[PDB]
Short mmCIF file of N, CA and C in Angstrom, two decimals:
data_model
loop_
_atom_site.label_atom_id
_atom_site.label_comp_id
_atom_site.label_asym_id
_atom_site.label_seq_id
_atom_site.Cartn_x
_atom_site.Cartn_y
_atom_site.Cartn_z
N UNK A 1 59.97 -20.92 -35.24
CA UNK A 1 59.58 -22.21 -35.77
C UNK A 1 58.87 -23.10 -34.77
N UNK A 2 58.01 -22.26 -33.99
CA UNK A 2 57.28 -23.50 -32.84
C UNK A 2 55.61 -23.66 -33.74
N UNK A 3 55.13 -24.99 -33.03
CA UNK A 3 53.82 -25.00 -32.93
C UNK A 3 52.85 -23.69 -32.60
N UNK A 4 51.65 -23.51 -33.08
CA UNK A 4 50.54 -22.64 -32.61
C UNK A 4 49.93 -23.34 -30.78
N UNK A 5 49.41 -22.23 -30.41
CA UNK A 5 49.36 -22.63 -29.07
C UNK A 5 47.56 -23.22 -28.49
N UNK A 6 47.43 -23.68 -27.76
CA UNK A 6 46.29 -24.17 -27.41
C UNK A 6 45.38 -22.93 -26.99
N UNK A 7 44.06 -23.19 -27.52
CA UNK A 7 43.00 -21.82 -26.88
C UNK A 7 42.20 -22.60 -25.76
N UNK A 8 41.33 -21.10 -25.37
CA UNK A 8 40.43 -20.91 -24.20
C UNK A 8 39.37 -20.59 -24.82
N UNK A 9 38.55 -20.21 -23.96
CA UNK A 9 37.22 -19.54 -24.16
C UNK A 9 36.67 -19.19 -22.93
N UNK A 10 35.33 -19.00 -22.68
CA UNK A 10 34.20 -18.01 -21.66
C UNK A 10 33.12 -18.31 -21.91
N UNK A 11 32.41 -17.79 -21.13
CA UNK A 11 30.80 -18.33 -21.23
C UNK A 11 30.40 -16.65 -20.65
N UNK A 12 29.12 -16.13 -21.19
CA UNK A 12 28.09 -15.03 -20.23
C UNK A 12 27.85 -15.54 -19.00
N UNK A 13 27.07 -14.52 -18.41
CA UNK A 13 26.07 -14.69 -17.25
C UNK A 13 24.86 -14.57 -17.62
N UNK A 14 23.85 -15.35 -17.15
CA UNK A 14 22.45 -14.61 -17.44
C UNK A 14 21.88 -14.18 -15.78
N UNK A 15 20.72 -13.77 -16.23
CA UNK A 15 19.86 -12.86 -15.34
C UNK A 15 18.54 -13.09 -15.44
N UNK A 16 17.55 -13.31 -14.54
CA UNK A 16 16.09 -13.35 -14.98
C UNK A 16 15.23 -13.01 -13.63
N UNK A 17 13.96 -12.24 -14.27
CA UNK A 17 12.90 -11.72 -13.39
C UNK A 17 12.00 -12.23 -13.41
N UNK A 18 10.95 -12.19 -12.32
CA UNK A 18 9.31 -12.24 -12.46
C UNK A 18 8.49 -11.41 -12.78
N UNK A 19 7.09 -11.75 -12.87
CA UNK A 19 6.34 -10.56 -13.18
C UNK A 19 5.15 -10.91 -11.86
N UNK A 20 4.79 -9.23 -11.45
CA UNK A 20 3.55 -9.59 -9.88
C UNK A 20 2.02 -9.25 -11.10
N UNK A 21 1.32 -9.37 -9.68
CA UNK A 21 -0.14 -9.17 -10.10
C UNK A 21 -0.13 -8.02 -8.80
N UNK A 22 -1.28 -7.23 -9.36
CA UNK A 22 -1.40 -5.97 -8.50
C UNK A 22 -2.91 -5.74 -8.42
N UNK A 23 -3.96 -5.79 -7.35
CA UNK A 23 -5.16 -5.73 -7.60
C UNK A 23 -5.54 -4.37 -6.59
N UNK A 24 -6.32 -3.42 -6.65
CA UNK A 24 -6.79 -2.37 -5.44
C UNK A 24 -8.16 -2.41 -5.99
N UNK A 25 -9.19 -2.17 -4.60
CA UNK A 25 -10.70 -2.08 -5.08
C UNK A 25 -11.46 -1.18 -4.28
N UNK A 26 -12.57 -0.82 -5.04
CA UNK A 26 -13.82 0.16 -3.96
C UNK A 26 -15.11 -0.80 -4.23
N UNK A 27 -15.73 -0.37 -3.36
CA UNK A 27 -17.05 -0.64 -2.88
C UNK A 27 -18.14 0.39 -2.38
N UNK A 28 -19.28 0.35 -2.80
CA UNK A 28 -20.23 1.65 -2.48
C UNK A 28 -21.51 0.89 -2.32
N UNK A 29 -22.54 1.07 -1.52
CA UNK A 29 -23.81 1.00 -1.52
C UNK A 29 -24.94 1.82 -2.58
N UNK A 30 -25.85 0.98 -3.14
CA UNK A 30 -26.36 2.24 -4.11
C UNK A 30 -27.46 3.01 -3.61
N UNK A 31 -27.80 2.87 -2.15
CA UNK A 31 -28.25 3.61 -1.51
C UNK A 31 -27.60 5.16 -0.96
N UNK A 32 -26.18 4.66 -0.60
CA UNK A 32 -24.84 5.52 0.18
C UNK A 32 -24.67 6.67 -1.60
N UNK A 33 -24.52 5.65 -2.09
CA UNK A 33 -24.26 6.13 -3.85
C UNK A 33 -25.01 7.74 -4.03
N UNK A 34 -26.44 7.97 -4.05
CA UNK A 34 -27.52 8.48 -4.42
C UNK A 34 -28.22 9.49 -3.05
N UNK A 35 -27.44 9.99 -2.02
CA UNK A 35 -27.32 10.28 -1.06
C UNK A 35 -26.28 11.49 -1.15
N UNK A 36 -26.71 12.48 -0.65
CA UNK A 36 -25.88 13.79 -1.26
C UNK A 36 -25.03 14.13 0.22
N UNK A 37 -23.51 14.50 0.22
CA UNK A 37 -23.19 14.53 1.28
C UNK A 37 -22.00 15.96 0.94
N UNK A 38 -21.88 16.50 2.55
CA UNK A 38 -20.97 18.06 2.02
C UNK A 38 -19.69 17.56 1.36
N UNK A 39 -18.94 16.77 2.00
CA UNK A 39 -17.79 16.90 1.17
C UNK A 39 -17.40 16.05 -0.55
N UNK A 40 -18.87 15.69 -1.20
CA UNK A 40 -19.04 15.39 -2.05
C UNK A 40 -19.24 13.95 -2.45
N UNK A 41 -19.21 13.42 -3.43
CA UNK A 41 -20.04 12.23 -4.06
C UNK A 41 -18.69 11.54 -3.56
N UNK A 42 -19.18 10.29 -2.45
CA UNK A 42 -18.46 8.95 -2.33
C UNK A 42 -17.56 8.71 -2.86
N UNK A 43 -18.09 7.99 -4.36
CA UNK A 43 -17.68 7.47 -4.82
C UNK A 43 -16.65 7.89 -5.93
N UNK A 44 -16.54 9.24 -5.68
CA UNK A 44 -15.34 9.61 -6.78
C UNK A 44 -14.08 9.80 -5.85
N UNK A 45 -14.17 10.07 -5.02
CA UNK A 45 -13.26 10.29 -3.76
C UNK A 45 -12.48 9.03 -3.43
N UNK A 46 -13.32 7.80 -3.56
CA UNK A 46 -12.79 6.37 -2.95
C UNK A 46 -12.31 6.19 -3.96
N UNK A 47 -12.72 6.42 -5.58
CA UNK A 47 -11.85 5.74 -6.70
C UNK A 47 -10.36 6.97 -6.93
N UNK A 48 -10.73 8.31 -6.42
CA UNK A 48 -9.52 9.10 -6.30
C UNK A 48 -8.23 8.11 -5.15
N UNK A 49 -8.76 8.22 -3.96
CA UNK A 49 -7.97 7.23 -2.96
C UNK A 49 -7.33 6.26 -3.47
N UNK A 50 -8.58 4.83 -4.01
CA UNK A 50 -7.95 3.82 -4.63
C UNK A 50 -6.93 4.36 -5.81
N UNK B 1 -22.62 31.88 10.45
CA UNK B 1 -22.60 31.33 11.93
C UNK B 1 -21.51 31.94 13.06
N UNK B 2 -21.69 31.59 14.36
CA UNK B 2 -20.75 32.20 15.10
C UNK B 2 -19.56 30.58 14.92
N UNK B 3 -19.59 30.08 14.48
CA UNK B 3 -19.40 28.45 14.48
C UNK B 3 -19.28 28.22 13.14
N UNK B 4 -17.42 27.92 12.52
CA UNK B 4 -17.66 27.33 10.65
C UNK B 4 -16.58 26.25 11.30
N UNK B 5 -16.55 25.52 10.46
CA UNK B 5 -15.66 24.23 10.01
C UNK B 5 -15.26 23.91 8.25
N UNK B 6 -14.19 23.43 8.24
CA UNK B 6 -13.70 22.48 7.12
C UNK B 6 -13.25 21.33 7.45
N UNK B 7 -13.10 20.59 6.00
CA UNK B 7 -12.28 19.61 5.75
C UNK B 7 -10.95 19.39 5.35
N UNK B 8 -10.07 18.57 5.92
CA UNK B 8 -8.70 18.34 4.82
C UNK B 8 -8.52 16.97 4.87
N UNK B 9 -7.58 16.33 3.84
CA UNK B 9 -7.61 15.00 3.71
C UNK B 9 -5.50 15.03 3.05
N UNK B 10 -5.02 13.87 3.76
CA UNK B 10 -4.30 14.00 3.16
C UNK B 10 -3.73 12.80 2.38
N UNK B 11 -2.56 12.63 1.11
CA UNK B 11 -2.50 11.38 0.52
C UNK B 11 -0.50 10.99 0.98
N UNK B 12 -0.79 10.07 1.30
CA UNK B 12 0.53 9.89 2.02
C UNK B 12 1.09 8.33 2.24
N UNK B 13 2.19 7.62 2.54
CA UNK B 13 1.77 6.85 2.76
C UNK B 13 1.19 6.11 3.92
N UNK B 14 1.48 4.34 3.59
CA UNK B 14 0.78 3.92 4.93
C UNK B 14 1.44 3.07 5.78
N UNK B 15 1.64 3.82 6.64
CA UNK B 15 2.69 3.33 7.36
C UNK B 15 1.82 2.48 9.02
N UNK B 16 2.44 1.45 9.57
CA UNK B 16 2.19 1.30 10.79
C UNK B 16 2.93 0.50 11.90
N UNK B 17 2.42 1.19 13.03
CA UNK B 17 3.70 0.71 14.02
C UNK B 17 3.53 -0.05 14.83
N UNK B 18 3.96 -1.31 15.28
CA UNK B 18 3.95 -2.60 16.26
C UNK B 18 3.86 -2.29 17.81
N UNK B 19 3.37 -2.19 18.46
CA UNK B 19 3.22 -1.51 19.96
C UNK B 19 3.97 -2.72 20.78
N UNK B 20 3.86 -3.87 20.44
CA UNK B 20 4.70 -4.86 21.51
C UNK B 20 5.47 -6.00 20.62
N UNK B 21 6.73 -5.85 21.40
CA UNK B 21 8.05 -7.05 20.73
C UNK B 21 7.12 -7.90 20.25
N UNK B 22 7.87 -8.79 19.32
CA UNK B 22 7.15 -9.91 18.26
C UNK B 22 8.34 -10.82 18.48
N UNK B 23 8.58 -12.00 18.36
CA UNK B 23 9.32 -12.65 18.10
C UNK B 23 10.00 -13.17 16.54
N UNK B 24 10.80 -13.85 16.37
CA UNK B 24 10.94 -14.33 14.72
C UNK B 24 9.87 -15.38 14.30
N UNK B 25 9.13 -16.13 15.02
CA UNK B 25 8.20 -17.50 15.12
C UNK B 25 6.76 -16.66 15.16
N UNK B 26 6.63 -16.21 15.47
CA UNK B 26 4.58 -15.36 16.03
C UNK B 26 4.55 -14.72 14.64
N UNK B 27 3.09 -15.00 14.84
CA UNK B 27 2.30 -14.31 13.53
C UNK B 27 1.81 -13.83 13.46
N UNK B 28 1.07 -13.19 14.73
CA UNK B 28 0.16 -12.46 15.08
C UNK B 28 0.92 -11.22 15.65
N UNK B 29 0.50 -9.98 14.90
CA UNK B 29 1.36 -8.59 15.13
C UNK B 29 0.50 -7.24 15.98
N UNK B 30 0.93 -6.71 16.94
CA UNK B 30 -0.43 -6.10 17.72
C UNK B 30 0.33 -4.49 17.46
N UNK B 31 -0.37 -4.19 16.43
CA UNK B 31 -0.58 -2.98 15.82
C UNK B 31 -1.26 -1.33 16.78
N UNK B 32 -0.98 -0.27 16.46
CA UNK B 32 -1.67 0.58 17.09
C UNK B 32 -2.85 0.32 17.06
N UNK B 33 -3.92 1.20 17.57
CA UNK B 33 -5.87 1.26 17.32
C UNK B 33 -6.07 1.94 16.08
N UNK B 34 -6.79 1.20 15.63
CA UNK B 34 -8.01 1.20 14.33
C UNK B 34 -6.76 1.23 13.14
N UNK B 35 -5.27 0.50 12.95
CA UNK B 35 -4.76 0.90 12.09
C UNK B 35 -4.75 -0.32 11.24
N UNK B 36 -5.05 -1.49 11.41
CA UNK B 36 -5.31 -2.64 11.14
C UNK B 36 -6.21 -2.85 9.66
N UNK B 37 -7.03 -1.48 10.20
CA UNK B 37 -8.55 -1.88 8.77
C UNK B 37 -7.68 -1.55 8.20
N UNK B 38 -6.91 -0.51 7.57
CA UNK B 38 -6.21 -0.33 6.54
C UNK B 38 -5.72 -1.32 5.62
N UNK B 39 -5.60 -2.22 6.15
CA UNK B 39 -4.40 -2.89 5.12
C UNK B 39 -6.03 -4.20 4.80
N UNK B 40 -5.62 -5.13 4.35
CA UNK B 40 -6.70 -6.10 3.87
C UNK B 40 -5.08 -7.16 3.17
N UNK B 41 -5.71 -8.63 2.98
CA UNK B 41 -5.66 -9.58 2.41
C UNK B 41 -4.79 -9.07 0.95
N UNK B 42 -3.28 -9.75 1.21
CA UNK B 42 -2.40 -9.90 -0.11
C UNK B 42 -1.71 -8.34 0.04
N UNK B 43 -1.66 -7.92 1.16
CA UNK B 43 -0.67 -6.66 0.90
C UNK B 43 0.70 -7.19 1.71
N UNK B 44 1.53 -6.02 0.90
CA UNK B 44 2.94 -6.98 1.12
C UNK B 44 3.54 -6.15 1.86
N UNK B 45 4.37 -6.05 3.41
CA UNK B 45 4.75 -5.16 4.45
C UNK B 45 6.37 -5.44 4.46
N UNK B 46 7.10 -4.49 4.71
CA UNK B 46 8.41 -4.52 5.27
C UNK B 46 8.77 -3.43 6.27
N UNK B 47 10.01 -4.29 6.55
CA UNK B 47 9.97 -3.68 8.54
C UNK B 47 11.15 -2.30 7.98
N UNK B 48 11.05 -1.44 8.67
CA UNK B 48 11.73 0.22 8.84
C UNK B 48 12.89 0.23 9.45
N UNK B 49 13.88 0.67 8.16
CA UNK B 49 15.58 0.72 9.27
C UNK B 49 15.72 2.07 8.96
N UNK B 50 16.92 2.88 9.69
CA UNK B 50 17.22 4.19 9.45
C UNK B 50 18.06 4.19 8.09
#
């Protein structure tokens, strides 16, 4: 025969991120470009690299 | 020929190493030779523990 008893409660946590920027670049001469060399065309090599 | 050559290239990362103490205050970091061009404007570096 007693009273009901007093409650509680809780709360979450939160969590939060950023977001980056990411930039990589090539550069070629269109002289260097059009110029035949042994181990092959420049510019596919530098955008392979990049 | 009595005389051949090739090429190899490899993709790896890029790592580089400080040749003289730095302090926590200096900003200026004196790197091995020619390893400097590598890097350019907005790249982001952290230092190497075991």
């Amino acid at each position: 025969g007693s009273l009901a008893p007093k409650s509680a409660t809780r709360n979450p946590v939160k969590l939060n991120n950023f977001c980056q920027i990411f930039k990589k670049s090539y550069e070629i001469t269109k002289t260097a470009d059009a110029t035949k060399a042994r181990t092959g065309s420049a510019l596919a090599n530098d955008k392979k690299r990049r | 020929d009595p005389e051949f050559s090739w090429w190899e290239e490899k993709l790896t990362h890029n790592r580089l190493e400080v040749k003289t103490e730095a302090a926590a205050g200096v900003t200026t970091l004196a790197v091995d030779t020619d390893q400097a061009w590598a890097c350019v404007k907005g790249d982001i570096l952290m230092v190497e523990s075991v």
